[PDB]
Amino acid sequence: EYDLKRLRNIGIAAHIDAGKTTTTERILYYTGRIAVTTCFWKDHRINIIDTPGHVDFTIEVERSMRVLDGAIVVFDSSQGVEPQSETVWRQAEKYKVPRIAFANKMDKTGADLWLVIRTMQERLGARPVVMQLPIGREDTFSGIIDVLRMKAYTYGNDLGTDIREIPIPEEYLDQAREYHEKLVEVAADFDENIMLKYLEGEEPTEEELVAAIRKGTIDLKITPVFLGSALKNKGVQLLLDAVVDYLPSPLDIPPIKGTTPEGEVVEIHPDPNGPLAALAFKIMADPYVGRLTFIRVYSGTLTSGSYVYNTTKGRKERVARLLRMHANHREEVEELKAGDLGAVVGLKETITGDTLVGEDAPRVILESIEVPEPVIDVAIEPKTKADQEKLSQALARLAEEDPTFRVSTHPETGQTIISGMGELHLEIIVDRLKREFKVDANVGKPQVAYRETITKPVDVEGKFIRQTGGRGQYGHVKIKVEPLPRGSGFEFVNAIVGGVIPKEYIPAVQKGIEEAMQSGPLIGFPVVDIKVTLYDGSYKEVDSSEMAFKIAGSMAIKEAVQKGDPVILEPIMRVEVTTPEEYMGDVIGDLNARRGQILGMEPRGNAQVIRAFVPLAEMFGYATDLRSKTQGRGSFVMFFDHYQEVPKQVQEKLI
Numbered sequence: 343e344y345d346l347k348r349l350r351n352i353g354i355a356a357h358i359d360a361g362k363t364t365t366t367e368r369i370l371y372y373t374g375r376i377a378v379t380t381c382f383w384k385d386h387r388i389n390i391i392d393t394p395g396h397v398d399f400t401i402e403v404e405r406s407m408r409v410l411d412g413a414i415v416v417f418d419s420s421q422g423v424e425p426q427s428e429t430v431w432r433q434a435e436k437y438k439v440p441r442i443a444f445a446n447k448m449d450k451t452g453a454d455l456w457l458v459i460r461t462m463q464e465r466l467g468a469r470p471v472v473m474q475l476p477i478g479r480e481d482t483f484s485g486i487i488d489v490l491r492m493k494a495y496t497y498g499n500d501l502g503t504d505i506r507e508i509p510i511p512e513e514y515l516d517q518a519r520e521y522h523e524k525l526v527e528v529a530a531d532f533d534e535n536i537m538l539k540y541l542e543g544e545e546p547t548e549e550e551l552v553a554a555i556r557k558g559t560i561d562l563k564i565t566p567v568f569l570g571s572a573l574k575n576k577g578v579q580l581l582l583d584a585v586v587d588y589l590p591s592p593l594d595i596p597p598i599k600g601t602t603p604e605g606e607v608v609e610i611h612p613d614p615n616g617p618l619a620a621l622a623f624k625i626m627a628d629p630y631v632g633r634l635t636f637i638r639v640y641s642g643t644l645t646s647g648s649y650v651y652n653t654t655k656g657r658k659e660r661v662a663r664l665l666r667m668h669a670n671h672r673e674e675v676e677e678l679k680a681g682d683l684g685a686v687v688g689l690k691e692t693i694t695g696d697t698l699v700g701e702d703a704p705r706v707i708l709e710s711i712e713v714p715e716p717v718i719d720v721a722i723e724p725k726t727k728a729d730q731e732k733l734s735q736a737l738a739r740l741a742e743e744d745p746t747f748r749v750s751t752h753p754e755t756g757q758t759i760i761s762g763m764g765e766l767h768l769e770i771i772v773d774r775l776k777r778e779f780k781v782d783a784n785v786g787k788p789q790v791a792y793r794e795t796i797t798k799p800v801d802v803e804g805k806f807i808r809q810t811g812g813r814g815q816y817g818h819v820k821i822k823v824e825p826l827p828r829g830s831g832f833e834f835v836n837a838i839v840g841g842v843i844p845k846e847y848i849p850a851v852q853k854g855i856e857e858a859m860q861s862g863p864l865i866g867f868p869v870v871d872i873k874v875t876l877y878d879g880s881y882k883e884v885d886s887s888e889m890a891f892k893i894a895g896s897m898a899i900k901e902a903v904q905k906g907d908p909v910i911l912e913p914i915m916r917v918e919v920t921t922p923e924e925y926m927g928d929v930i931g932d933l934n935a936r937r938g939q940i941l942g943m944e945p946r947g948n949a950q951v952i953r954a955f956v957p958l959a960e961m962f963g964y965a966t967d968l969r970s971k972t973q974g975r976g977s978f979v980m981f982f983d984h985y986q987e988v989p990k991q992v993q994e995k996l997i
């Protein structure tokens with residue numbers, strides 16, 4: 343039943359509209375006749391892993407690529423590797439994932455196989471090796487020639503229900519012999535035994551070839567290529583074969599790496615008997631069973647009805663059931679062994695990124711712990727409260743699956759404000775808002791979340807003394823406000839000596855300080871990184887109140903941040919641009935005019951990779967500035983890094 347060798351853990355990467363969904367639907371179908379979906383082909387368990395909706399989704403991508411072992415990259419035979427198709431490739435390259443390739447849509451007009459092969463060779467530097475030729479051109483496209491084995495299959499309809507092996511037609515007999523030769527010439531690069539047979543012109547054996555091509559695929563040197571039309575059902579069974587021949591099992595890729603509690607790195611082996619280590623990569627809210635938290639298992643066995651320690655978060659979780667999702671049904675299983683993926687039921691306080699271990703087995707983490715700061719805000723004016731009522735429920739329901747964002751109510755516009763770690767993040771949340779959770783609102787343009795703070799210690803005071811509301815009000819506080827090292831946040835001390843301020847009012851003061859740190863004086867963004875010591879004041883015996891000392895506190899914070907040489911803090915993003923070698927300096931220059939700070943350029947593949955420190959505020963609509971400077975071919979990722987005082991002229995320009 344469970345045999346690692348015969349496990350094939352895959353995802354499908356493709357341009358948008360290239361054919362990922364159709365190809366996936368079609369695979370499921372063919373493996374039918376008897377977040378992570380499971381099926382069987384020729385005694386192999388193929389766990390198709392769902393790869394992000396768009397490639398820019400950078401956090402999900404990284405995580406969904408160490409959850410898979412090998413990938414199928416799908417190109418539109420009409421257009422070639424369309425500049426975003428280069429970008430999905432760079433992904434696989436980046437995460438060192440063994441891959442095959444699939445020239446989809448060989449049935450449409452414009453479908454050129456050779457365009458794909460060439461563009462793969464030239465642009466991506468991929469080393470395609472042709473493993474089949476198409477019999478036919480457009481609508482004429484009817485057959486597919488396996489040049490490894492020198493056979494040919496023909497398709498008697500566009501339904502998937504008539505595949506007959508035929509000899510290669512003599513019209514394609516030259517071309518096939520030609521490409522078989524190329525294949526055997528390649529295979530010999532990875533098998534010495536095949537080298538001494540290619541000399542002799544002694545046709546080596548299918549075992550040898552397949553093994554050789556495979557070794558090459560898995561060690562990231564070659565990229566076999568197959569074609570077909572997933573829509574008109576041709577080539578999807580051979581593509582499925584390909585998965586089982588050339589794509590890696592968990593035994594084939596190097597073991598994932600994990601961090602002990604002492605910052606140390608451990609290599610983590612697929613030994614199904616050894617300790618347990620799982621990584622959770624998606625949470626979903628299934629109707630018939632509640633919340634499913636999908637995991638991938640690296641070592642040991644995860645047994646249904648058992649307890650696992652969540653090393654990311656400190657608690658234990660109850661593994662109630664274990665599931666496998668199939669195309670058309672679910673399946674309860676007793677265990678998921680090392681090399682496998684499923685869903686688990688139970689697990690109240692487990693979220694994605696988190697690491698599940700064997701309870702009394704070594705505590706290791708598998709990702710980074712730090713939380714991306716909420717660096718981009720968006721305002722939404724809800725409809726007529728009839729939407730707010732289902733908005734608010736949804737937004738708080740959004741945070742049952744996602745803790746990487748914050749919800750606030752703006753101190754002085756009334757609006758509801760979402761905060762995230764980038765724009766796309768928010769763009770997809772709004773997507774889930776007006777559709778999935780059905781909500782409507784006047785959405786605002788995304789903006790950078792700045793922060794204020796003071797650069798020098800001050801010693802101010804606050805007085806509120808009025809005859810409002812019928813009675814007499816009075817509250818007097820004196821504070822010392824001093825700057826706190828970056829990222830330290832807030833600190834309050836009470837140092838009031840002896841009823842100088844009546845104990846009842848100290849809370850009211852604090853509230854006042856708190857409610858007024860929410861709007862700095864430079865641009866009305868939250869004050870941060872300061873220490874507030876309440877050290878004096880006065881009351882008037884009947885006139886004082888809570889309202890009074892609230893405002894007094896508030897009025898002294900507004901003073902302390904005006905006198906303290908206030909400065910604005912901006913978020914500084916860590917940027918990695920992937921560009922073809924040619925645009926290097928023409929791209930570096932553009933980063934350098936964004937107040938960037940180049941940290942060094944090493945090459946990845948044939949492309950090059952620049953590292954920088956560009957501030958978030960010099961980045962809005964960056965992707966269209968890359969596609970203008972890289973002939974469409976470049977791309978970039980972006981992560982928070984640190985807040986930095988704005989430079990003099992940017993302070994002035996932001997006021």
Ligand SMILES: Nc1nc2c(ncn2[C@@H]2O[C@H](COP(=O)(O)OP(=O)(O)O)[C@@H](O)[C@H]2O)c(=O)[nH]1
Pocket residue numbers: 356357358359360361362363364365446447448449450570571572573574
């Ligand atoms: N002509 C043709 N069209 C295809 C083929 N495969 C997919 N499509 C088209 O692609 C569209 C859906 O694309 P999809 O599979 O979702 O690609 P994705 O955007 O990468 O997920 C459908 O409208 C299909 O008409 C094919 O083999 N031939």
Ligand SMILES: [Mg+2]
Pocket residue numbers: 362363
């Ligand atoms: Mg799709």
